[PDB]
Amino acid sequence: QQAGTETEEYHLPLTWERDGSSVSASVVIDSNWRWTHSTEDTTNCYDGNEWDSTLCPDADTCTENCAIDGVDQGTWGDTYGITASGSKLTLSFVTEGEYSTDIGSRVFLMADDDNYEIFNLLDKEFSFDVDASNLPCGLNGALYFVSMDEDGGTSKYSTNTAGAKYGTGYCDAQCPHDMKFIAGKANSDGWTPSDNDQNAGTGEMGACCHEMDIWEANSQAQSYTAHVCSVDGYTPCTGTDCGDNGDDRYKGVCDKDGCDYAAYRLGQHDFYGEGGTVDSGSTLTVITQFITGGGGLNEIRRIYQQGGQTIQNAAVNFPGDVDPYDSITEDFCVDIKRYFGDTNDFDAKGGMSGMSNALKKGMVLVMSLWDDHYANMLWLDATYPVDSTEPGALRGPCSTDSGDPADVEANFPGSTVTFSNIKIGPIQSYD
């Protein structure tokens, strides 16, 4: 995409801590949340959930003709319900503006006006605080890393002149087709509007890359998941390469399921939640350690702190069936996938070594708040598949009727997540 000139681009300031020193940074809104319009005027190129057939008769003409616009200082709060102060950032779910309504948001941490911050997580401890108290069943307030390009695509894709400054270049391990710009081009060829999301559609292209989910959670359940892909960084896909939901799920270049560590799923039902060992009713500190051996990742450990207590990660609880692993390791991934009857696509795509190499190349930090139009977040917080009674189906305490976006958007529009005190530093000892 190119950048429009209707609205000036302002990144929202955010402070964080890197190896002992305060960094005055900012966040940027993902391009998918922006207005896409003609370069000549205010006519929408993306209108509801379809592209304008006159402006965008094919992708190349669409790309020529259409621009993504800025988000100015006032737009952050007025349109997206996003606020920041100091080291704290708050995302909102439903924000009713003047003439339209926004649902959720996705933002990236900037290094400067033109480039994302790049995190090299190997042999480091990453931590932050989160308040997930105001996220019901069905919501996901997520903090995660993806193998995006630092500049958002502008060096590799000459029709992307907007770049990281306008939140371009998202990719993740789902190879999502709902991205409006991929590889610097409008993803308008083959576009089908979604049946249940009036702002969304899908195009021919997907946007694939490695993904390290540090925190996917609401007040009822939480997980952390490594997803490795067999391709190098940001990778556009078509066809079978995208590994689309359904028959193609395991046939693409990315591990969609991931090697997931979800305490409730692993048989620790009172560990996290309302009044849990980790109490989702109050702020908590999430510490994640990327442990290496011989320079390669071999373990992703989790520690929690809350009210001055240090809380070790809850171990796998299937006595006699699976060992009491308490972290993501190769053997955990293999053993738990066997017990759950899950295809081990993590190892297929490269496994821990693969992941390691992804982390070595550096990742972008993502914070988002969304609902789930595909699976109603049931994979996180309920039972999935809904009628399944075998090991690994049970995910959280929520009803299998929970999480329909039409329901949660109506019933809990005021839901929010707050992230704060982002920090990276050396791996610390926790007694």
Ligand X SMILES: OC[C@H]1O[C@@H](O[C@H]2[C@H](O)[C@@H](O)[C@H](O)O[C@@H]2CO)[C@H](O)[C@@H](O)[C@@H]1O
- Region binding ligand X by CB under 6 A among candidate stretches 94-102, 191-199, 253-261, 290-298: 253-261
Are 268 and 317 spatial neighbours (Cβ–Cβ below 8 Å)? yes
Number of helices and strands in the chain (H, E):
7, 30
Q: Which does 154 bind (CB under 5 to 8 A by kind): ligand X, Ca ion, none?
A: none
- Region binding ligand X by CB under 6 A among candidate stretches 162-170, 257-265, 285-293, 323-331: 257-265
Are 134 and 78 spatial neighbours (Cβ–Cβ below 8 Å)? no
Q: Which does 191 bind (CB under 5 to 8 A by kind): Ca ion, ligand X, none?
A: none
Instruction: Judge whether 302 is annotated as a binding position.
Output: no
Instruction: Judge whether 215 is annotated as a binding position.
Output: yes
Shortest Cβ distance from residue 252 to Ca ion (Å)? 10
Rule CB under 6 A: say whether 178 interacts with ligand X: no
Instruction: Judge whether 214 is annotated as a binding position.
Output: yes
Q: In the β-sheet with 66-68, what is the strand arrangement from edge to edge?
A: 2-3, 66-68, 36-38
In the range 305-344, which residues lie near Ca ion by CB under 5 A? 340
| Residue (of 233, 221, 231, 226) closest to 273 by Cα position | 221
Instruction: Judge whether 379 is annotated as a binding position.
Output: yes
Interface pick for ligand X out of 33, 116, 157, 379 (rule CB under 6 A): 379
Interface pick for ligand X out of 125, 216, 371, 381 (rule CB under 6 A): 216
Interface pick for Ca ion out of 393, 398, 417, 422 (rule CB under 5 A): 393
Whichever of 115 and 159 has its CB closer to Ca ion, that residue is: 159
| Residue (of 161, 164, 160) closest to 148 by Cα position | 164
As a whole number of angstroms, the longest Cα–Cα distance in the chain is 67
Rule CB under 6 A: say whether 381 interacts with ligand X: no
Is 216 a known active-site residue?
yes
- Here the tokens at position 137 are 């069943």
In the range 136-155, which residues lie near ligand X by CB under 6 A? none
Whichever of 211 and 260 has its CB closer to Ca ion, that residue is: 260
Other beta carbons within 10 angstroms of residue 296's beta carbon come to 14
Interface pick for Ca ion out of 5, 192, 240, 428 (rule CB under 5 A): 240
| Residue (of 407, 413, 365, 375) closest to 103 by Cα position | 413
125, 216, 274, 299: the active-site residue: 216
6, 9, 211, 274: the active-site residue: 211
Residue 114 has what DSSP assignment?
S
Q: What is the dihedral of CA 133, 136, 138, 141, to 10 degrees?
A: -20
Rule CB under 6 A: say whether 225 interacts with ligand X: yes
Q: DSSP characters for 343-398?
A: --HHHHTTHHHHHHHHHHT-BEEEEEEEE-TTTTTHHHHSBSSTT--STT-B--SS
Are 223 and 321 spatial neighbours (Cβ–Cβ below 8 Å)? no
Q: Which does 244 bind (CB under 5 to 8 A by kind): Ca ion, ligand X, none?
A: none
In the range 249-278, which residues lie near Ca ion by CB under 5 A? none
Rule CB under 6 A: say whether 213 interacts with ligand X: yes
Are 36 and 48 spatial neighbours (Cβ–Cβ below 8 Å)? no
Interface pick for ligand X out of 9, 178, 204, 257 (rule CB under 6 A): 257
Interface pick for ligand X out of 52, 260, 345, 381 (rule CB under 6 A): 260
Is 330 a known active-site residue?
no
- Here the tokens at position 201 are 């559609």
Q: Which does 235 bind (CB under 5 to 8 A by kind): Ca ion, ligand X, none?
A: none
Shortest Cβ distance from residue 53 to ligand X (Å)? 31
- Here the tokens at position 348 are 């297929």
Are 102 and 80 spatial neighbours (Cβ–Cβ below 8 Å)? yes
As annotated, the active-site residues are 211, 216
Binding residues (CB under 5 A) for Ca ion: these are 64, 240, 340, 392-393
